[PDB]
Amino acid sequence: HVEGLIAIIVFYLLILLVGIWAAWRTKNSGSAEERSEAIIVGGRDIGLLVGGFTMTATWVGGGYINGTAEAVYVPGYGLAWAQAPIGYSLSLILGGLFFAKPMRSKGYVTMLDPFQQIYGKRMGGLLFIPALMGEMFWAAAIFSALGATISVIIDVDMHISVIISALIATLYTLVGGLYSVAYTDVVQLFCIFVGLWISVPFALSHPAVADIGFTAVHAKYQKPWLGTVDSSEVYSWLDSFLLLMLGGIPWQAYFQRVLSSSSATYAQVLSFLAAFGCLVMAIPAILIGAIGASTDWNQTAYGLPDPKTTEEADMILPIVLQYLCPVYISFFGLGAVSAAVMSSADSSILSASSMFARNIYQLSFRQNASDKEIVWVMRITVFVFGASATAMALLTKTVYGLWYLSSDLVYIVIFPQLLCVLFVKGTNTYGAVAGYVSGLFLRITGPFKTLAMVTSFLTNICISYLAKYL
């Protein structure tokens, strides 16, 4: 109620102030005669602390902490079917092991730079379409989820909340660039960590909560929360896991921090330190889900209808932090959830705008452009993309339907091409078109998600080698 609103106002004011202050601090830190790169790659000196904070904050936002508890709470699901915490960590480990050093060693600026140099500028432009939709729909889904969460916590209609959040996210982003985004994520990580880890001890001691050890393997009010994977569901489980594991890498939000580190060796340690952070920040969510599963919602104020019978199972974590915690701590908990839902919007906006500013506007349409023109183009693009994302979140009712399609398209199309450029020699632009056509055809017409990725990958190689033989 009042405590939640007081937390939100303070948190957003602090974030705005830090974002503005970072721009003043770091306006002069860059190549003095190349201002276009200073707002994209950041001057190529970010250490272990700031890098480790921002890389962790990128991957631990969105629906992570609010859908990790829901999977544990809902009967028929459990720890077996909560695959985000393990998918993200394995994706980060694989990235740091195999992809991070080669990309940073060659000193690229954007993810599309490898493609345009070998395949061609036209093919680099064609691969811009799948990425831009993903970056512009992840932000829309995040904005919708934030509105839902805030309308549950307090009563302010979705429009004002989403508009006020999006304006603040865009304002410091266009003013600062990468440095504001990186310096504003330390506050978010500290808020989330402190709130969740101070809330969890108080919830566990409520008289209504039972023993989470006994509930895990024995049924008291509902089915055990460890879960079970049936013999029929093995392949669906593997496909769902592989989507997150092998589809989180080919994103520019990830490659904007791999390419902005001091050296190749410091671009691996950040991934290895973010893999640990993803696991560290997921334990309180699992614990809150287990609490919610073990609780008896008849002595608390929520009333006899259980949250999953009233059809509020997406908001189990706010309900626990509100009803099973004292107000002093509920303040910190609600601030933490509000910080958690908002984490990965600015990174997506900056990632979407940087590629259009560099690869599309500069390198293809207008090569002969000064740095001032490109700076203004980047700022205008940031504003337009933020406005478009907010409008899509508020008006259209098909945000998730398009997010699901774009997520599949990225994993089926972009990932096979990245492997081919980085690790396979002899590839041509005659096989890139074949892969791009074959993946799209199978996705649109008709586990078939992973089989399309292998068909897209294996059609890239055979045609490219065949074209050499003609």
Ligand X SMILES: COc1ccc(C(=O)NCc2cc(C(C)C)no2)cc1OC1CCN(C)CC1
What region, left, alpha or beta, does residue 428 occupy, with left being phi > 0 and alpha being psi -120 to 50 degrees?
beta
Q: Does 403 bind ligand X (CB under 6 A)?
A: yes
Q: Does 407 bind ligand X (CB under 6 A)?
A: yes
Q: How far is the CB of 155 from Na ion (least distance, A)?
A: 28
The residue (of 256 and 460) whose beta carbon lies closer to ligand X is: 256
What letter would DSSP give residue 224? -
Q: How far is the CB of 91 from ligand X (least distance, A)?
A: 7
The residue (of 268 and 348) whose beta carbon lies closer to ligand X is: 348
The residue (of 115 and 138) whose beta carbon lies closer to ligand X is: 138
Query: Do 22 and 183 contact (CB within 8 A), yes or no?
Result: yes
CA distance to 79, 209, 226, per residue, from 214 (Å): 15, 12, 11
| 341-360 footprint of ligand X as x/- string (CB under 6 A) | ---x----------------
| 232-251 footprint of ligand X as x/- string (CB under 6 A) | -----------xx--xx--x
The residue (of 177 and 250) whose beta carbon lies closer to ligand X is: 250
Query: Do 256 and 350 contact (CB within 8 A), yes or no?
Result: yes
Of 89, 347, 353, 455, which one interacts with Na ion (CB under 5 A)?
347
What letter would DSSP give residue 181? H
Q: Give start and end residues of each alpha helix (H) in 27-127.
A: 35-38, 48-59, 64-73, 84-94, 100-105, 113-118, 121-126
Q: How far is the CB of 411 from ligand X (least distance, A)?
A: 5
CA 93 from centroid of its chain's CA atoms: 16
Considering only residues 140 to 179 of the shown chain, the ones binding ligand X according to CB under 6 A are: 141-142, 145
248 binds, among Na ion, ligand X, none (CB under 5 to 8 A by kind): ligand X
Scanning 37-45, 167-175, 178-186, 429-437 for contacts with Na ion by CB under 5 A, the matching segment is 178-186
Q: How far is the CB of 207 from ligand X (least distance, A)?
A: 33
**Structure tokens of 252?**
């520019």
The residue (of 54 and 427) whose beta carbon lies closer to Na ion is: 54
The DSSP string of 288-355 is HHHHHHH--TTTSTT-SS-TTTTT--TTHHHHHHHHSS-HHHHHHHHHHHHHHHTTTHHHHHHHHHHH
Of 185, 273, 324, 350, which one interacts with Na ion (CB under 5 A)?
185
* Separation of alpha carbons 166 and 163, rounded Å: 5
| Rounded (10°) angle between helices 185-203 and 2-26 | 150
Q: Does 113 bind Na ion (CB under 5 A)?
A: no
Q: How far is the CB of 263 from Na ion (least distance, A)?
A: 23
Q: Does 408 bind Na ion (CB under 5 A)?
A: no
3-state secondary structure at position 103: helix
User: Tokens 């002969």, residue?
Assistant: 368
Q: Does 63 bind ligand X (CB under 6 A)?
A: yes
The residue (of 113 and 346) whose beta carbon lies closer to Na ion is: 346
356 binds, among Na ion, ligand X, none (CB under 5 to 8 A by kind): none
Q: Does 259 bind ligand X (CB under 6 A)?
A: no
* Separation of alpha carbons 438 and 430, rounded Å: 13
Residues that bind ligand X (CB under 6 A): 59, 62-64, 67, 84, 138, 141-142, 145, 243-244, 247-248, 251, 253-254, 344, 403, 407, 410-411
Residues that bind Na ion (CB under 5 A): 57, 185, 347
